[PDB]
Design a binder for this molecule. Structure first.
Ligand code: ZN
Ligand code: ZN
Ligand code: ZN
Ligand code: ZN
Lengths: 46, 48, 1114, 67, 216
């Protein structure tokens, strides 16, 4: 959710330290995305 | 014609070798890391 | 509804493809490999011993993939799509049993791992193999990827099917001057080897074999072939009376004038003139030194012990060459497929593999050597796990190979290039598009006119549409929909089986023979030329379609050449269609109800003897009709369907048969470049450059082929309302023109997912690289030069991100580049940072970023950007019909017509496009479309068929539009009746690559190349353009000097050189440097390119010392 | 991906009808245009997109992040 | 590094926007350059044996699938001891081994000496002695430190079954560090206490495995 990133398969939210671990907690799976901010953004529809 | 320099066709065999200026054939730079790209003339004559 | 001959045949090709997949050609090969090949390939070398240790050996037995003997299917392996993100190679380890010797009483087997095999998607051993819609989902990959390609390093590559000149059969080609080069070049396992033959001069004919010395009188060799006849020798190759009598005899003359009785003489004339044994095992130096190689020099094909087989074979070669050596034509040309046998992916992988593994074993001997050098105590200890250290040159080397595109074969020392490609994903079509493409090779230099024409025999067995201009090092072709490529079958059964028909051994034959009937040939090898050819062929072809040796192992006869041919050869093109039974088909029209019922399958026709695969030569014998409507009892076969003629891509063309082939060419070549759905997996995969379409739509009309490849489920294009008119005289040539507040309403809208990748690599300095950032001065805000990232200091999801800024910050240490020592105190803290700017001509967004790692345990970030391009002016819209066009001026709304329902002709094309370029299929297709929208149907109109036109009129007239597409309209500007009715109605247009916004490029002052300091090359790196010779010479003819003096002088390289009148050379500053001078120098201007030219010259030995003159003073 | 809100020419609201259309196709076996005939599209331009526009977005949802 | 010819600005910003690529200081407005130049497109006593050194190294190195990286790192160490002439009078295997070993130890990656020593006849007092000696002649000191938390992962990859193991892994770790806490961790092989915790949590995982399969 609000926190930093997500698994690939687990879709399990997780946060991480630096030079820490590539694995998530629950997944024996590696790759992970980065969650979208709470920061406001803008488009214009036209 | 033998005016001076051409001082007779004792020129036409190599007794001394002009080395190409560095500016002509640069060793490609190190470009992010320790990999340093050679250049053939540099390498060949530098074996000469 | 009873089944109808008009309707029924159509269900076949799909039902044909329903089971046997669209691409088996990369599949069943690769599958065949992982069973047949390796189980045989090691069975070649199962045993190795170094020269030492009388009692030792290493005995191979088992080869498998993905089974350690636990379960049947591999228990687990990494998911392929997931792997596509990790940049790994998607592969399975090898498991191998070897029982072997080490020391007293061992002879012990285990399961061993030589390494991993780079497997292929949707193979036997694939994960996705037998996967239904769920393992798809959970395994995060689209069902509709056709498969049949490899993936290595996370990129995606395909072995392109390599067409190879057919191998090991006699080809003889007449040629001007010369004397008609003949050849047969044979390869089996070891030693692919070529032997040409030809006349030298004026009837005087000799052997060239690069093995032999050269130029050997042939009939002399024919004696050396063991036949002593000297009568039949003529009589065999010659004929009876006719012409041939004299023609060959001159040979016999010069054959007679020297020697005779080969038994020593001739034979050891060859052993006398020949290359040496190459040192060792010249113990065979003899008269029979050649007698060994007499069998093996040219042909591995036969060998055996006495020569009469091989002899009479060679004689037969002599026959055909003296035959048309009598008269031109009457010669084989390399055009028809029968002389070109392509070989699919699987076989190539073995050929490559077995030699890799070859080098492996060979050096593994060398490995165990250093074990048995020095016998301290008792050394056994198997030295097996040393296979690890010695492994994976097989594995990783093979990766490097398949990724390279260049294969090095150290057995043959033969190296082929451009063997693979990056899979092209611009569409869904593109994927399977470059799959099922065919590369050519060889054909000497280009100017030979051979690699040019597209022949009649090409019918149905190669796409009649796309053969694009990418010729270069080869020739690109395509399979049709239905092409089976029959692999090798087997030999001995057909050999002794033909004998079961009662054919006679060569040995039982009358010497003078060829007079009687025609001939029999196995793969080009004659046996008896049995009597009674017809009923022979009938029975045989029957036996195939009935009891044995199905598919190929075909038969075809000849008159001109008296023969008949049966081959087991692999790598051949085959096509199905229906045998006529007497006057009509074998299906009896009720059997397709016995098909559509659901219990038939396919090949049931084959095994039950209805239809089967064919061949060029084969079908060149047979007689086929088009439709069941036209059928004659004199016929033989009949096609299932006409529309199998065009291939996958070409099937997209609606009503192809109404359009000139020049159009189907460009339309196929471009169609692969359209943009659209890709695949369901879309948004979970990350590509370097991957387009898409915002609102895809089904093309209003269907070509039956589209339903076959499941095309429309992945549409690429727009179903558009189009008028044909001259409106807004911007139209002119091929320029289209659009509607605003349509594209505004949305239309044609695009997104481009691009990517950037960064490998964080650690350093022997024991110092990694840091991703930190986000300085944020003033507390005010992260600096606009940077900003934009987030607390992590990396690009944020979904943010407008602009040129000059950084979406990813990579930094390495400055001391990281150098040689570390284990002496340190505090600061690694020095970091040279090279955060990569996103350059570009417009805004962009980041919707995905990935922090992940490869096998080697080092941090990695591969991210992607997307920007939605509005299909603005300059872009390329096409017709799917062969109209390549660029959108011109865009019109707001009010203008362009409306008419009765006020519909707006969204895309208004040009009249002069069609007629003089002449393509009616688009035009009629329109009518088909405006029909389709009525009764509310997707509509056929497939090739040679589908929807008739005449009905569609009645289909419109009831709803009250013209029986043409024509209609009144009203001036978009002036608002009144248009003078001429306008054909228009909905059609389907699409947007290609070549977005204008990429290619618009300009350079004010850009970089200069290290060497020439001029305008760095191309686009990308940076700008600057190319004025070449041919273009340059133009400006001469205008007499303009100053355009040159500006052009190749000032703004190319603006440069001064310091030169000296005395001893003219190029110095600098204050010296001529040959003469210590500081005086005579004249500062002046020359192209820096020119200085470069001098110094090069003068760097070699030469001097163009200059002379100077007053510019003024006359 | 979605029914486009309006057709590229008419610019009548399309979106409303896609749902109800598919409803009228699944239940109530009935002819395509005849449906749209009483569904309120009397002009083909609009009509195509109802006859057209394969619905992908669900075929995407297979790959949704949470699965 | 340089400074403006006039404004005496030392801070240089290179505008790549317009594709001129022109560097100027925000203090002047004058570029100091035009169009930056850019690139385009074994007989020795020691060095031959160095090609041998990487060769044998690179060969024997990744048989364990150790990082291509770390191998490169250790090579320079072999050159280091080569300078000290530590490489003279002893079996090359014991040397090349120790060389690699100091790297992975320094990088604290999951391998064990007793583990790594096995690719030969080694009594492990051989290599351990060697490594010990090159330490006597090298002032490299504290870096090679160890914990089982490394090893247990690479162990689990050999333990099969499912991913409860991973859950179990977290089990062992809390176990492990507690055993480090309970002060019995010291003076014994990391492999032993490692497989110890692995067992104990597998017994916590209600599975049937064997000490054999563990010491494996
Ligand atoms: Zn996870
Ligand atoms: Zn001078
Ligand atoms: Zn409309
Ligand atoms: Zn300045």
């Amino acid at each position: 959710a609000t926190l930093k990133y997500i698994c690939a398969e687990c879709s399990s939210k997780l946060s991480l330290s630096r030079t820490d671990a590539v694995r998530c907690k629950d997944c024996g799976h590696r790759i992970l995305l980065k969650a979208r901010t709470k920061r406001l953004v803008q488009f214009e529809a036209r | 014609d033998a005016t001076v320099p051409s001082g007779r066709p004792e020129t036409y065999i190599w007794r001394y070798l002009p080395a190409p200026p560095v500016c002509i054939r640069p060793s490609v730079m190190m470009q992010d890391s320790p990999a340093s790209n050679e250049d053939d003339l540099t390498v060949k004559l530098t074996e000469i | 509804d009873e089944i109808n001959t008009a309707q029924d045949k159509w269900h076949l090709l799909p039902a044909f493809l329903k089971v046997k997949g669209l691409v088996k050609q990369h599949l069943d090969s690769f599958n065949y490999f992982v069973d047949t090949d390796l189980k045989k390939i090691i069975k070649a070398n199962q045993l190795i011993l170094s020269d030492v240790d009388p009692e030792f050996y290493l005995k191979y037995v088992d080869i498998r993939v993905g089974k350690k003997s636990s379960s049947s299917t591999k228990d687990y392996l990494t998911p392929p799509h997931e792997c596509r993100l990790r940049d790994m190679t998607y592969s399975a380890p090898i498991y191998v049993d070897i029982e072997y010797t080490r020391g007293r009483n061992i002879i012990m087997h285990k399961d061993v791992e030589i390494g991993r095999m780079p497997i292929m998607l949707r193979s036997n051993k694939c994960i996705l193999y037998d996967a239904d819609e769920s393992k798809m989902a959970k395994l995060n990959e689209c069902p509709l990827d056709p498969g049949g390609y490899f993936i290595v390093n996370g990129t995606e590559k395909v072995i392109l099917v390599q067409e190879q000149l057919s191998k090991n059969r006699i080809i003889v080609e007449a040629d001007e001057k010369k004397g008609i080069v003949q050849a047969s070049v044979t390869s089996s396992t070891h030693e692919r080897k070529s032997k040409t033959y030809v006349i030298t001069k004026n009837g005087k004919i000799y052997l060239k074999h690069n093995s032999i010395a050269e130029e050997i009188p042939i009939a002399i060799v024919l004696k050396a072939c063991g036949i002593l006849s000297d009568l039949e020798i003529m009589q065999l190759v010659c004929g009876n009376d006719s012409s041939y009598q004299d023609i060959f005899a001159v040979n016999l003359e010069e054959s007679s004038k020297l020697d005779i009785y080969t038994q020593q003489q001739a034979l050891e004339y060859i052993g006398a003139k020949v290359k040496t044994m190459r040192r060792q095992k010249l113990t065979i130096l003899q008269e029979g030194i050649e007698a060994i190689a007499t069998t093996v020099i040219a042909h591995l094909t036969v060998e055996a012990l006495d020569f009469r087989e091989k002899a009479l074979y060679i004689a037969m070669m002599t026959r055909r060459v003296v035959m048309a050596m009598y008269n031109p034509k009457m010669i084989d040309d390399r055009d028809y497929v029968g002389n070109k046998r392509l070989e699919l992916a699987g076989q190539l992988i073995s050929l490559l593999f077995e030699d890799l593994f070859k080098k492996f074993n060979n050096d593994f001997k060398l490995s165990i050597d250093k074990v048995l050098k020095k016998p301290n105590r008792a050394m056994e200890y198997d030295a097996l796990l040393s296979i690890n250290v010695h492994s994976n040159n097989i594995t990783s080397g093979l990766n490097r190979a398949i990724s390279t595109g260049n294969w090095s074969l150290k057995r043959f020392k033969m190296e082929r290039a451009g063997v693979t490609h990056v899979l092209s994903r611009l569409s869904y079509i593109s994927a399977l598009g470059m799959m099922t493409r065919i590369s050519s090779q060889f054909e000497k230099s280009r100017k030979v006119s051979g690699p040019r024409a597209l022949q009649p025999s090409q019918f149905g067995m190669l796409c009649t549409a796309d053969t694009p201009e990418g010729e270069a090092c080869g020739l690109v072709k395509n399979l049709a929909l239905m092409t089976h490529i029959t692999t090798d079958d087997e030999e001995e059964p057909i050999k002794k089986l033909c004998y079961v028909l009662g054919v006679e051994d060569i040995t039982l034959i009358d010497s003078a023979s060829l007079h009687l009937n025609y001939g029999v040939y196995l793969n080009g090898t004659l046996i008896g030329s049995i009597r009674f050819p017809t009923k022979f062929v009938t029975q045989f072809r029957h036996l195939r379609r009935t009891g044995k040796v199905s598919e190929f192992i075909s038969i075809y006869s000849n008159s001109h050449q008296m023969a008949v041919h049966i081959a087991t050869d692999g790598g051949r093109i085959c096509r199905p269609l229906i045998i006529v039974s007497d006057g009509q088909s074998r299906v009896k029209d009720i059997h397709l109800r016995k098909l559509l019922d659901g219990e038939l399958d396919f090949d049931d026709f084959l095994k039950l003897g209805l239809v089967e695969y064919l061949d060029v030569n084969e079908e060149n014998d047979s007689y086929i009709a088009l439709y069941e409507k036209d059928i004659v009892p004199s016929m033989t076969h009949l096609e299932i369907e006409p529309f199998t003629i065009l291939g996958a891509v070409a099937g997209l063309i609606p009503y192809p048969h109404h359009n000139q082939s020049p159009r189907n060419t460009y339309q196929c070549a471009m169609g692969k470049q359209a943009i659209g759905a890709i695949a369901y997996n879309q948004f979970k995969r990350i590509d370097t450059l991957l387009y898409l379409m915002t609102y895809p739509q089904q093309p209003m009309v269907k070509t039956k082929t589209i339903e076959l490849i499941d095309y429309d489920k992945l549409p690429a294009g727009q179903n558009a309302t189009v008028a044909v008119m001259s409106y807004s005289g911007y139209d002119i040539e091929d320029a289209l023109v659009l509607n605003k507040s349509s594209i505004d309403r949305g239309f044609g809208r695009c997104e481009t997912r691009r990517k950037t990748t960064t490998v964080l690599k650690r350093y022997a300095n024991h110092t990694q690289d840091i991703i930190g950032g986000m300085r944020v001065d003033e507390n005010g805000d992260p600096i606009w030069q940077h900003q934009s990232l987030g607390p992590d200091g990396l690009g944020e999801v979904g943010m407008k991100v602009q040129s000059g800024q950084i979406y990813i910050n990579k930094s390495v240490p400055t001391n990281s580049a150098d040689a570390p020592n284990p002496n340190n105190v505090n600061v690694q803290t020095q970091y040279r940072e090279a955060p990569v700017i996103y350059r570009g001509p417009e805004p962009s967004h980041i919707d995905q970023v990935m922090m992940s790692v490869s096998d080697n345990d080092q941090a990695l970030i591969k991210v992607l950007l997307r920007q939605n391009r509005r299909p603005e002016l300059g872009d390329k819209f096409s017709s799917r019909h062969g109209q390549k066009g660029v959108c011109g001026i865009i019109v707001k709304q009010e203008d362009m017509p409306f008419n009765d329902q006020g519909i707006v002709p969204d895309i208004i094309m040009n009249p002069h496009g069609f007629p003089s370029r002449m393509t009616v299929g688009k035009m009629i297709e329109l009518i088909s479309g405006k029909a389709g929208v009525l009764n509310g149907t997707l509509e056929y109109g497939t090739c040679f068929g589908g929807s008739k036109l005449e009905d569609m009129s009645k289909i419109l007239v009831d709803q009250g539009f013209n029986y043409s597409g024509k209609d009144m309209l009203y001036s978009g500007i002036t608002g009144e009746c248009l003078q001429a009715y306008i054909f228009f109605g909905p059609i389907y247009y699409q947007k290609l690559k070549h977005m204008v916004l990429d290619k618009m490029h300009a350079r004010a002052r850009g970089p200069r190349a290290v060497l020439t300091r001029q305008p760095t090359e191309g686009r990308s790196r940076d700008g600057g353009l190319r004025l070449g010779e041919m273009e340059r010479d133009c400006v001469i003819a205008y007499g303009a000097s100053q355009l040159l003096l500006e052009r190749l002088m000032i703004s190319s390289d603006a440069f001064e050189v310091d030169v000296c009148d005395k001893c003219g050379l190029m110095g600098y500053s204050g010296w001529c440097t040959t003469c210590k001078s500081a005086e005579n120098i004249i500062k002046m201007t020359i192209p820096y390119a020119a200085k470069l030219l001098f110094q090069e010259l003068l760097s070699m030995n030469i001097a163009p010392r200059l002379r100077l003159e007053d510019i003024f003073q006359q | 991906m979605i029914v486009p809100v309006r057709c590229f020419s008419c610019g009548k609201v399309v979106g409303d009808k896609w749902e109800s259309y598919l409803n009228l196709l699944q239940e109530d076996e009935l002819d395509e245009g005849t449906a749209l005939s009483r569904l309120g599209l009397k002009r083909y331009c609009c009509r195509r997109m109802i006859l057209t526009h394969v619905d992908l977005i669900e075929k995407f949802l297979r790959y949704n992040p949470l699965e | 590094m340089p400074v403006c010819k006039n404004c005496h600005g030392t801070e240089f910003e290179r505008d790549l926007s317009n594709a001129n690529n022109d560097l100027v200081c925000k203090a002047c407005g004058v570029v100091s350059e035009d169009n930056p130049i850019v690139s385009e497109v074994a007989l020795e006593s020691r060095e031959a044996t160095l090609n041998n050194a990487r060769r044998k190294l690179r060969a024997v190195s990744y048989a364990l699938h150790i990082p291509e990286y770390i191998t490169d790192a250790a090579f320079q160490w072999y050159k280091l001891a080569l300078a000290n002439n530590f490489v003279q009078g002893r079996r090359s295997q014991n040397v090349i081994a120790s060389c690699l070993y100091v790297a992975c130890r320094k990088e604290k990656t999951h391998h064990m000496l007793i583990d790594f020593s096995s690719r030969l006849q080694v009594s492990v007092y051989s290599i351990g002695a060697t490594f010990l000696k090159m330490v006597k002649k090298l002032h490299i000191t504290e870096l090679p430190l160890a914990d089982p938390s490394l090893f247990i992962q690479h162990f689990a990859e050999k333990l099969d079954l499912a991913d409860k193991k991973i859950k179990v892994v977290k089990d062992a770790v809390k176990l492990a560090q507690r055993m480090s806490k309970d002060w019995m961790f010291e003076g014994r092989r990391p492999a032993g206490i490692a497989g110890a915790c692995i067992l104990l949590a597998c017994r916590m995982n209600n599975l049937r495995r064997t000490h054999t399969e563990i010491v494996a």
